[PDB]
């Protein structure tokens, strides 16, 4: 663990350089020392504020919300220093956490950050208002390289189908709750109640984890099949038949 701390006492202009110090040290350690590296960049919103101030010092051109027009290029310069390279063994990972003012996803900072990146986690305020830790929503979460990350040879063949159908059931359940919130009990159906039971079990068991437990992947997949077992196998549209033949009777 190597730290580049930047307390709030420090001058505002100093914040421009610190991320590049961290990243150049990471590149050296990952492409010259042949070590796997993990990067964490805290409070990119403050970095955006510092960049805005430095740009406003020279009276440059704004975009949306008075931020610099070349903020996209700058953030790309920061984030694109990642990946793996031929002829080597090490790699670089980044977890660029940021703050999200007023919970608006259309704000320029999170929007540009999402454009440059390939996913999001979206820590959620309402789950923290129900005091469940870690408060993680999965409806907007995306890992676009799961397509090649998972499958048999890494974990198991039917992991992808499990994720797809579990997510489909999650979205359908959220829609069912929104619809029940207006129409009333009499305008529901039994399938809606099954989705609500799935939600009950899903949020109250699967999402809630515990601060210090190191779960195992196959345990997660077994609980996934537990959750998928609830409904009739016929309603599972997004799973091919052979997976149901192999795994549903278990």
């Amino acid at each position: 663990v190597c730290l580049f701390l930047n307390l709030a006492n420090d001058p505002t202009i100093e914040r421009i350089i610190t991320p590049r110090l961290a990243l150049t040290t990471a590149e050296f350690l990952a492409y010259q020392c042949e070590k796997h590296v993990l990067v964490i960049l805290t409070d990119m919103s403050s970095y955006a504020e510092a960049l805005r101030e430095v740009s406003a010092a020279r009276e440059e051109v704004p975009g949306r919300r008075g931020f610099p027009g070349y903020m996209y290029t700058d953030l790309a310069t920061i984030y694109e220093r990642a990946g793996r390279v031929e002829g080597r063994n090490g790699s670089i990972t980044q977890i660029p956490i940021l703050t999200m003012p007023n919970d608006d996803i259309t704000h320029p900072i999170p929007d540009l950050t999402g454009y440059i990146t390939e996913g999001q986690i979206y820590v959620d305020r309402q789950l923290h208002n129900r005091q469940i830790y870690p408060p993680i929503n999965v409806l907007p979460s995306l890992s676009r390289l799961m397509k090649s990350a998972i499958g048999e040879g890494m974990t198991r063949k039917d992991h992808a189908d499990v994720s797809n159908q579990l997510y489909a059931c999650y979205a359908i359940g959220k829609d069912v709750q929104a619809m029940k919130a207006v129409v009333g009990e009499e305008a529901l159906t039994s399938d809606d109640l099954l989705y609500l039971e799935f939600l009950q079990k899903f949020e109250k068991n699967f999402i809630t984890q515990g601060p210090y437990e190191n779960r195992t992947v196959y345990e997660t997949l077994d609980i996934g099949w537990q959750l998928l077992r609830i409904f009739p196998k016929e309603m599972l549209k997004r799973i091919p038949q052979s997976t149901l033949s192999e795994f549903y009777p278990r």
Binding site: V61, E80, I116
Partner: protein, 206 residues
């Protein structure tokens, strides 16, 4: 041969569109197809993955040549394109050939310089016209031209010019119109009486 990129190549006489373009997706083919010669747009916010549509169209088509130009995207997408396209193969004439024997790529990741973003798109369209002058059918494909517009905004901003709207210089609309105009079926200039066409599909990052 050497050619000034900005200047549009001449031609004999434009012809009307009379034959569709094969589409690898079920939707936007039976509902909203694109002709072999038409122009298209694929805007949308992030999280949709329009790059999926781009790659799917690139892999499966009835065209003779394919040209894909990347402007301001992720390097992971180009790693995908380079690694995966060799392995895929198809043929019409016996031996099974790789599809990169009919594909040419231009590359510009987001970290690359600013005006190279313009250079990439203009080089791509000029190459498409040059290959159309062989009497072939060539498709072209773009990736987030809004990044190109942003780059022009930045450079014009450092030149102390009047911003027109949202900071973007006034002439960008004209530049986009001129860029999208060079397309469609045309009679080629030559005694052999060859004939080809160009299709363009463009991506926008609002």
């Amino acid at each position: 041969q050497v050619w000034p990129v900005r200047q549009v190549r001449p031609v004999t006489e434009k012809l009307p569109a009379n034959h569709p373009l094969l589409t690898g997706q079920r939707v936007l083919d039976a509902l909203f197809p694109c002709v072999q010669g038409g122009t298209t747009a694929i805007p949308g916010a992030f999280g949709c993955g329009k790059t999926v549509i781009s790659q799917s169209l690139s892999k499966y088509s009835n065209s003779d040549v394919i040209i894909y130009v990347g402007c301001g995207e992720r390097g992971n997408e180009m790693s995908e394109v380079l690694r995966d396209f060799p392995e895929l193969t198809m043929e019409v004439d016996g031996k099974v050939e790789s599809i990169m024997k009919r594909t040419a790529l231009v590359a510009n990741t987001s970290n690359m310089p600013v005006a190279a973003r313009e250079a990439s798109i203009y080089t791509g369209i000029t190459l498409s016209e040059y290959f159309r002058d062989m009497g072939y059918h060539v498709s072209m494909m773009a990736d987030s031209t809004s990044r190109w517009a942003e780059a022009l905004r930045e450079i014009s901003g450092r030149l102390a010019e009047m911003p027109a709207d949202s900071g973007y210089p006034a002439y960008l609309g004209a530049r986009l119109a001129s860029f999208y105009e060079r397309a469609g079926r045309v009679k080629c200039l030559g005694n052999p009486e060859r004939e080809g066409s160009v299709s363009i599909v463009g991506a926008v990052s609002p």
